[PDB]
Design a protein around this ligand. Sequence first.
Ligand code: NA
Length: 184
Amino acid sequence: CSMVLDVAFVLEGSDKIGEADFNRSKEFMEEVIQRMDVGQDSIHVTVLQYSYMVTVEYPFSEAQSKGDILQRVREIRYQGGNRTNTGLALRYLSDHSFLVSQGAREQAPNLVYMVTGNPASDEIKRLPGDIQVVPIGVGPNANVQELERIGWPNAPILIQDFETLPREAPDLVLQRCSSGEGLE
Ligand code: NA
């Protein structure tokens, strides 16, 4: 995937996820960033972690080089919160992450890959259409119809478990990046 694109990664870092499975999420994300043409004139990346609260791990407003982003990702620490506040994470995207004042490019399309394994704890409001969300629902505890509503027009990418995530998901994520649509 090589294009002008503001990409967000949103990883659930709750206790229900656990440190092992969160690290699998991190490793999935690293592999995606490695495959993406991340650079000042191409793909830009923001990274969020959420559970009880939402942490901006890397804003668009910081250096948009693959090396700088990947190293910050390695430094991300599992929070292990007691909630899955997916609604709050989505509000961050619309009201903070994708603002020009926060480093987003006005003429770049917006794409979000959100990794979650549990039902939302909180109220979820539908995002403005200009923020495209591709939900990645991992494991048996994902609330699928909830993800379908968050994702529209994007079908959720359903992954059997966090072990499979870093192996299977990157290909699908990059296909969606380049074409602008999910498969079949
Ligand atoms: Na943008």
